[PDB]
């Protein structure tokens, strides 16, 4: 561990997202910010809202600069509108630098802020191509790298607890680490394996094979990346393209057939509970995603356990039972490797070398019989054909 100042600087959980503390303005205004590798804007609440107990007050910052331009950001689950500007920004438990970055001051929103999440803004870590209004609005990390000597790379260790965390607990627990500008060896075990970043917009990758307990899903690999596959700290579930989801669920049901679960469970709608300590992890299969390697015709695989894809939730009666929701769901916008994948691994976003690294996380949840894994290499042909083209 060479970055002790940044280790354990995250808080939160997959259901509400993971956040890091940041400061904006002069004097510094502290805010908690959602870490999102699935978007590219730095936006913070800048007006009163029922679910916020603090927000960015531009009139109190001597270094605030108005860009005199609005920004509207509508998405599937919600939306927000803001006013663009720039200000000095820092990350207390991060690199010891202060940079002038773009900030979308959120003045109106719908279904964005969450009651009890404890975060007041979002940090989009993806590329400029997907920044709103357009790619001319420089993303925070781009500014950080351009204005300082911080290496163009960051790594994330998202730590799921393995059990439900109440309001007080989630506030006092360490949710993981975001190492800005480097890789901390204390956050993973084994080796790091890299997959190429296919294109720099979202953090796009290419999946070349999928197994459920060693059994090949056997679909045309293009299906696995239709219409794209991305790594997103801002998505709770492992989301799969409709046809892949259908085949995967069928296989997971078959592997766990000694126990029957209601359709609502598989739809991610209702929870399933077991007497305290008796969750039958062993009847559920491990899932392996093979990713294109850096060497020609070479791939590697990352394997997760049900301890990753069964999300712990508190029982409706807050009993002593151990309950979960199935965290794999369908998508009409490609594969999304969300917290379900990320909680099992230390993930290195090596922007400098256009690649993403994976290693078994020192904080992944497992049992005495199985562990998450990152293994390689495997001989794989025509992997370029697995990538989708409109
Ligand atoms: C998938 N995904 C995502 N990666 N990021 C967004 C948000 C995620 C959460 C959220 C809430 C709770 C838990 C978790 C988790 N884990 C995440 C709140 S808002 C932001 N977004 C944008 N997209 C494009 C441009 C700008 C923006 C913004 N802002 C589309 C949203 C989305 O649907």
Curated annotation (Swiss-Prot):
The active site is at 36, 232. Residues 1-390 are extracellular. GO terms for cellular component: axon; cell surface; dendrite; early endosome; endoplasmic reticulum lumen; endosome; endosome membrane; Golgi apparatus. Induction: Up-regulated by the Ca(2+)-regulated transcription factor NFATC4. N-Glycosylated. Addition of a bisecting N-acetylglucosamine by MGAT3 blocks lysosomal targeting, further degradation and is required for maintaining stability under stress conditions. Its main location: membrane. Residues 18-359 form the Peptidase A1 domain. It is found in: Cell membrane; Golgi apparatus, trans-Golgi network; Endoplasmic reticulum; Endosome. Expressed at high levels in the brain and pancreas. In the brain, expression is highest in the substantia nigra, locus coruleus and medulla oblongata. Glycans are attached at residues 96, 115, 166, 297. It catalyses: Broad endopeptidase specificity. Cleaves Glu-Val-Asn-Leu-|-Asp-Ala-Glu-Phe in the Swedish variant of Alzheimer's amyloid precursor protein. DXXLL motif is required for a proper endocytosis and retrograde transport to the trans-Golgi network, as well as for regulation of lysosomal degradation. The transmembrane domain is necessary for its activity. It determines its late Golgi localization and access to its substrate, APP. This is Beta-secretase 1. It comes from Homo sapiens (Human).
């Amino acid at each position: 561990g060479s970055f002790v100042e940044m280790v354990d600087n995250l808080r939160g959980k997959s259901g509400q997202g993971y956040y890091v503390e940041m400061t904006v303005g002069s004097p510094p205004q502290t805010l908690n910010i959602l870490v999102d590798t699935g978007s590219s804007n730095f936006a913070v609440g800048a007006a009163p809202h029922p679910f916020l107990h603090r927000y960015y007050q531009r009139q109190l910052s001597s270094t605030y600069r108005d860009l005199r331009k609005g920004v509207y950001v509508p998405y599937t689950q919600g939306k927000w509108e803001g006013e663009l500007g720039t200000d000095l920004v820092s990350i207390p438990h991060g690199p010891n630098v202060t940079v002038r970055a773009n900030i979308a001051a959120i003045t109106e929103s719908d279904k964005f802020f969450i009651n009890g999440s404890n975060w007041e803004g979002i940090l989009g870590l993806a590329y400029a191509e997907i920044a709103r209004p357009d790619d001319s609005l420089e993303p925070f990390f781009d500014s950080l790298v351009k204005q300082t000597h911080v290496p163009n790379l960051f790594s994330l260790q998202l730590c799921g607890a393995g059990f439900p965390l109440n309001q007080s607990e989630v506030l006092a627990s360490v949710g993981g680490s975001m190492i800005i500008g480097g890789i901390d060896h204390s956050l993973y075990t084994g080796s790091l394996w890299y997959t190429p970043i296919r294109r720099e917009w979202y953090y796009e990758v290419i999946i070349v094979r999928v197994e459920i307990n060693g059994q090949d899903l056997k679909m045309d690999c293009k299906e696995y990346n239709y219409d794209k596959s991305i790594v997103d700290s801002g998505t709770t579930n492992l989301r799969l393209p409709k046809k892949v989801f259908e085949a995967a669920v069928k296989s997971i049901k078959a592997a766990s057939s000694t126990e029957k679960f209601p359709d609502g469970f598989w739809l991610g709608e209702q929870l399933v509970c077991w007497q305290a300590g008796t969750t039958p992890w062993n009847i559920f299969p491990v899932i392996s995603l093979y990713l294109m390697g850096e060497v020609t015709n070479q791939s590697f695989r990352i394997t997760i356990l049900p301890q990753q894809y069964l999300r712990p939730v508190e029982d409706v009666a807050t009993s002593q039972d151990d309950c979960y929701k199935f965290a794999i769901s369908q998508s009409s916008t490609g594969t999304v490797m969300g917290a379900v994948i990320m909680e099992g691994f230390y993930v290195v976003f090596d922007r400098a070398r256009k690649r993403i690294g994976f290693a078994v996380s020192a904080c992944h949840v497992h049992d005495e019989f199985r562990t998450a894994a990152v293994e390689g290499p495997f001989v794989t042909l025509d992997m370029e054909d697995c990538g989708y083209n409109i």
